[PDB]
Amino acid sequence: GLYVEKVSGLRKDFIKGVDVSSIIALEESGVAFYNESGKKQDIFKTLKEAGVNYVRVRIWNDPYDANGNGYGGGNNDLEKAIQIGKRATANGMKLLADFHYSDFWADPAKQKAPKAWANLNFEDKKTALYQYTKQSLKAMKAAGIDIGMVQVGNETNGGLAGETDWAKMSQLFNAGSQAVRETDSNILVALHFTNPETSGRYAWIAETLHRHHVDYDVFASSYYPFWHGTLKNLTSVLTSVADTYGKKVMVAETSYTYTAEDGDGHGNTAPKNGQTLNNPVTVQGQANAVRDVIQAVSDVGEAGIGVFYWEPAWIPVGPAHRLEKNKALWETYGSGWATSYAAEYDPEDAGKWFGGSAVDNQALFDFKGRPLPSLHVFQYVDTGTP
Ligand SMILES: OC[C@H]1O[C@@H](O[C@@H]2[C@H](O)[C@@H](O)[C@H](O[C@@H]3[C@H](O)[C@@H](O)[C@H](O)O[C@@H]3CO)O[C@@H]2CO)[C@H](O)[C@@H](O)[C@H]1O
Ligand SMILES: OC[C@H]1O[C@@H](O[C@@H]2[C@H](O)[C@@H](O)[C@H](O)O[C@@H]2CO)[C@H](O)[C@@H](O)[C@H]1O
Numbered sequence: 001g002l003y004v005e006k007v008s009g010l011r012k013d014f015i016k017g018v019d020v021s022s023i024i025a026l027e028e029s030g031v032a033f034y035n036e037s038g039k040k041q042d043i044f045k046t047l048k049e050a051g052v053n054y055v056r057v058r059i060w061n062d063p064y065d066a067n068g069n070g071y072g073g074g075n076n077d078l079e080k081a082i083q084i085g086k087r088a089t090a091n092g093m094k095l096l097a098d099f100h101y102s103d104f105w106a107d108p109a110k111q112k113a114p115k116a117w118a119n120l121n122f123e124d125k126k127t128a129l130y131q132y133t134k135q136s137l138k139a140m141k142a143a144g145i146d147i148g149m150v151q152v153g154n155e156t157n158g159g160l161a162g163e164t165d166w167a168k169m170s171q172l173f174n175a176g177s178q179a180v181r182e183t184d185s186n187i188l189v190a191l192h193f194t195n196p197e198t199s200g201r202y203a204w205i206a207e208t209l210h211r212h213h214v215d216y217d218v219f220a221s222s223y224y225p226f227w228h229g230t231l232k233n234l235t236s237v238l239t240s241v242a243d244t245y246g247k248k249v250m251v252a253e254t255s256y257t258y259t260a261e262d263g264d265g266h267g268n269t270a271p272k273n274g275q276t277l278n279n280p281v282t283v284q285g286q287a288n289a290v291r292d293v294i295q296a297v298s299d300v301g302e303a304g305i306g307v308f309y310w311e312p313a314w315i316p317v318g319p320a321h322r323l324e325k326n327k328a329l330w331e332t333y334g335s336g337w338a339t340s341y342a343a344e345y346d347p348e349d350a351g352k353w354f355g356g357s358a359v360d361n362q363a364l365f366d367f368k369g370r371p372l373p374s375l376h377v378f379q380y381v382d383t384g385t386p
C-alpha cells in the first residue's frame with residue numbers, strides 16, 4: 001500500500017536515525033515489539049532491517065529524586081544509554097549520544113543545571129561538565145559501543161546547564177566538545193538548536209558560535225512540521241550555516257502524526273488546532289512528512305548529512321480506557337513522559353502534566369507494537385516505491 005517518492009540527489013551515506021530512548025522503560029513496563037511477520041523481535045533488529053543506520057539517545061545526569069524515584073521520560077541516564085548503545089551497535093548502527101546536561105528534559109524553556117551542579121561556581125561547573133562528558137564517553141567505549149556522534153546540549157536556544165549568557169554557554173560547549181575530541185577524533189561534535197522558522201535565529205547563533213570560537217562539526221536542528229515553518233525555509237537556513245561557516249548540518253528531531261487517536265489515555269502533542277498539518281494525518285501522510293524532511297536536508301548539498309526521527313516507538317503501555325491502570329506503570333517504570341516524582345525538579349511543567357506518552361500517535365509502530373508500513377520510508381527514499 002505505501003508510496004514513497006524517491007528523494008532526488010540523496011547521498012548513499014545519508015544518516016537515517018531514530019531516537020528510541022524510551023525503549024528501556026517501555027520494555028520494563030511490559031511493552032513488546034514485533035516485526036512484519038508478527039513475531040516478537042528486538043526493536044533494534046526491526047529498525048536495522050528497516051534500513052535505519054543510526055541511534056540517538058538522550059542522557060540526563062541524575063533523573064531521580066533523593067530516594068531514587070525516576071523522573072520518568074524514560075529515566076534516561078548513562079546506564080540506560082549504555083544499554084541502548086550496546087543493542088544499537090550489536091545491530092550495526094552507530095550511536096548519537098545526546099547530552100542534555102540536566103537531570104531532566106532540556107529544551108528552549110528548560111535548561112536547569114543538574115542537581116549536583118546546582119551550586120558550583122561557573123569554573124567548577126565547566127569542569128564538571130567536561131569530566132562528566134569525558135567519563136560517560138569512556139564508559140561507553142568500554143562497553144564496546146560504536147559512537148559516531150555526540151550532541152553537546154539539546155535545543156540550547158537560550159541556555160545550557162543553568163547558564164543563559166552566550167559567552168558562558170560557548171565555554172560550556174567547548175568544555176563538552178573538548179571531552180569528545182579527547183575521546184576520539186573521528187566522533188562528530190554536534191550542537192542542537194530549534195525553531196528554524198524564527199527570522200534570523202540560526203544565522204545569529206551560527207555567528208555567535210563563531211565569534212566565541214566554539215569548536216563543533218554539525219549544526220543540528222529540530223524540525224517538527226507543525227511548528228517550525230516550511231521545508232523551504234529549513235533548507236534555506238541550514239544552507240546558510242553550512243556555506244557561511246563550513247559546518248555539516250542535519251535534523252536531530254522530527255516526526256509526524258499517523259493518527260489523531262490517543263492510544264494510552266494521556267493527551268498527545270499533536271495534532272491540535274492551530275498546528276500546521278500539510279500532510280494528512282495517516283500512515284501515508286506520516287511517510288510523506290519524513291520523506292520530505294530527508295529531501296529538505298539532502299537539498300542542502302554535501303553539508304546535509306542526515307535526519308533523526310524522534311521517538312518512533314513510544315507506544316502506550318495499555319489502552320486509553322485503562323488510564324488509571326496505566327498511570328501505575330508510568331509512575332513505576334517512568335515509561336511516560338514524566339512522573340509525579342519530577343515535580344521537585346520541574347514543578348512548573350512536569351509538576352502539573354506528568355503522565356504517559358504524548359507522542360504514541362507519532363510512532364512508526366501501532367499501539368500494539370506492530371510496525372506501520374511507514375517504517376519503510378527509510379529504505380524507499382533511496383529508490384522510491386515501484
Ligand atoms: O498531554 C496533553 C498536553 O500536553 C502538554 O505538554 C506537556 C508539557 O508542556 C510538554 O513540555 C511535555 O513535552 C515533553 C518535553 O517537555 C518536550 O521537550 C519534548 O519534546 O516532548 C516531551 C513529551 O513528548 O509534554 C507534557 C505532556 O504532554 C501540552 O502543553 C498541552 O497543551 C497538552 O497538549
Ligand atoms: O516538544 C517541545 C518543543 O518545543 C518547541 O519550542 C516551543 C515553541 O515552539 C518556541 O517558540 C518557544 O520558544 O519554546 C517552546 C518550548 O517551551 C521547540 O521548537 C520544539 O523543537 C520542541 O522542543
Ligand SMILES: [Ca+2]
Binds near residue numbers: 266
Ligand atoms: Ca498518549
